[PDB]
Design a protein around this ligand. Structure first.
Ligand SMILES: [Mg+2]
Ligand SMILES: [Mg+2]
Lengths: 62, 352, 352
């Protein structure tokens, strides 16, 4: 999905469903799906391209 | 069946010197049970039981025969049939038993992969259709070669999808990218394979020789699964909805010139929607293997015989060869551009 | 531009006797404005302005020509083209202007309708496929008639989809339901229409006569839209995934017998998923128009000539007719069941 020009990668269960992003004025993004809370997206100051996110998820699943 | 933690606690507290009876009191377990667990290897918390008889056992072979020979998968129909036979239970057990036999509906989640620089390339064809070019009906096809790490795109139009044309387009792609990849992904084309020999793929011998010559390792995704090569298919959609939508042409050379100009202008210049960078910069980041000096000759090779007088005919063409080349056998190397050359025992004929 | 409420308040408070200046003070409006509005017909809160010039006006004819003759709808391509011509603005105006020309993607919302009792019926065909029945390859078709209010279902298998077979199946449906509806919905079959004569439908003359004979009003949904008759299509899915999935047969009579038994057992007995009631109860609630005593004769009518001797031939068949019927013209009424009868000037021939 996308948020303010940055694209995030969720897991299988979340594909094809509507999540709710909640962003404090502090500057931290929290993803709430179906009332519950899902894993944090380790938001970073430096923007990383979708390709780098795919590579990171690939290495993590490896 | 004291759990892992309970057994650990019992053993630890007992070995610490604490009395066993008050240990049992504290953990709410019988003294005999605790004492037995004192001299035990590891926490026992598992009980193994084998399958047991059910209600749909006698009908199970009949239902399996129905499914596997009559193709019936309607739980209502099978239930109504077996109910007459004597079954009395509900349909939930029937559905649960029959679920494995049902076909697995295709998934919708799509894994994403990011190949290493100078490590993968993808190739594909696109049958544009039939057009009247210069009053001649030809079947136009588009060859697309997409790099995996820089998302570059080379393309070229052709009138045929013969192994020779495929190899020549691969040569053009390798020259365009300034090198050859370490892996090239195709779909299951007979110009690259000859079928799945019991799961394993059998490479076409000539194409295998070509690949070994240029050093790139071929790969094939799978039968009836084009997702694995999504880069090149999406590039095909890009080209066929951006370039070949309204552009008009009369010669394939003109079309190829326009296509190359368009690629170098926008296609390989616009930043990608995922990598978020101009493909040419990533290309500069690419490290492809060097090209060989001499390209794999991709030209039709036929053997013909010269007539008595010395008139040699190829296709709807005619030559005039010296008398010394009359009645003998010669080789007609036809390059894909139409440059026909005549050879006689290695020598080249100055055909008129 | 005082709004409706402001004008109402001004007029009312002024007419009540309140002074105008303090009225203006209270409502925060200029005294001249309030006084002008005192003698005004109705609240003025609307300003009308006509279109104005934009930046993409000179290019608009060219873009329209591109869209309507080159079929280009890629905003990037058109933008890149017109940018050379002289345009300097962004693509948003281009997309907004080009949106109306784009094709309207099909909707996904689906209206739901519930017809009145004894007021609507739906009919359709289903090409089952080709089967070897009794060593003979025939194209089996399924005719389905679904009532609209009770969701009843009548079905029958046939070897042909000729107007005669259609009318006979309609007779069978009307007899099965014990009456004729007030409306019958088909799709655009040539056995019921002859094309859309500029939006209006032209009914087949014979079928129109048939409908006027039984009194039911025909209707056709639309070209290339089968949703309007979802009841019968879903009933077709029901039958083809429940009855004709594993059932085996050798004669069409046997298949029809099994189909009728299955319908009367489960199909017209199981409660519907939406009406939540057994279809037969709703059938009892239905009020269909009475059937005519004599059914519209649906039988092939051909005129033949008797040979010199008296041997009369129809299809691959032969008869022996009395000498008085030799060399003359007779009528061969072939009923769909195969009952061939011979007529001669109204009289019936006792053909041997
Ligand atoms: Mg392909
Ligand atoms: Mg139809």
């Amino acid at each position: 999905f996308s948020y303010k020009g940055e694209q995030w990668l969720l897991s299988a269960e979340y594909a094809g469903k509507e999540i709710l992003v909640k962003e404090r004025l502090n500057g931290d993004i929290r993803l709430y799906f179906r009332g519950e809370e899902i894993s944090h997206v380790d938001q970073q100051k430096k923007v990383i391209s979708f390709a780098e996110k795919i590579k990171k998820k690939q290495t993590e699943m490896a | 069946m004291i759990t892992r933690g309970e057994f650990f606690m019992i053993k630890e507290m007992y070995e610490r010197g604490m009395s066993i009876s008050d240990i049992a009191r504290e953990l709410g377990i019988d003294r005999k049970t605790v004492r037995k667990y004192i001299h035990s290897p590891n926490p026992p918390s598992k009980s193994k039981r084998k399958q047991r008889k059910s209600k749909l056992d006698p009908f199970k072979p009949y239902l399996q025969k129905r499914m596997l020979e009559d193709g019936v998968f309607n739980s209502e129909k099978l239930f109504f049939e077996i109910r007459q036979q004597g079954y009395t239970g509900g349909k939930t057990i029937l559905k649960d038993y029959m679920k494995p036999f049902r076909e697995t509906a295709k998934k919708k989640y799509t894994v994403r992969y990011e190949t290493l620089p100078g490590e993968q390339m993808q190739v594909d064809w696109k049958e544009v259709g039939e057009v009247v070019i210069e009053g001649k009906k030809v079947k136009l096809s588009l060859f697309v070669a997409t790099l995996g790490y820089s998302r570059m795109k080379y393309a070229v139009f052709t009138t045929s999808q013969d192994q020779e044309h495929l190899m020549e387009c691969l040569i053009q792609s390798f020259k365009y990218f300034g090198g050859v990849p370490k892996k090239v992904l195709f779909d299951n084309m007979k110009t690259v394979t000859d079928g799945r020999e019991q799961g394993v793929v059998k490479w076409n011998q000539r194409f295998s020789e070509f690949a070994s010559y240029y050093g790139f390792i071929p790969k094939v995704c799978r039968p009836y699964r084009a997702q694995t090569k999504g880069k090149v298919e999406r590039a095909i959609q890009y080209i066929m909805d951006h370039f070949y939508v309204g552009t008009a042409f009369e010669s394939i050379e003109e079309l190829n010139f326009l296509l190359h100009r368009w690629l170098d202008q926008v296609a390989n210049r616009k930043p990608n929607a995922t990598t978020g960078i101009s493909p040419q910069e990533r290309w500069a980041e690419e490290s492809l293997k060097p090209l060989p000096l001499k390209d794999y000759d991709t030209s039709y090779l036929s053997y013909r015989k010269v007539h008595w007088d010395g008139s040699f005919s190829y296709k709807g063409e005619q030559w005039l060869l010296s008398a010394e080349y009359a009645g003998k056998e010669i080789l007609v190397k036809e390059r894909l551009n139409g440059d026909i050359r005549l050879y006689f025992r290695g020598e080249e004929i100055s055909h008129v």
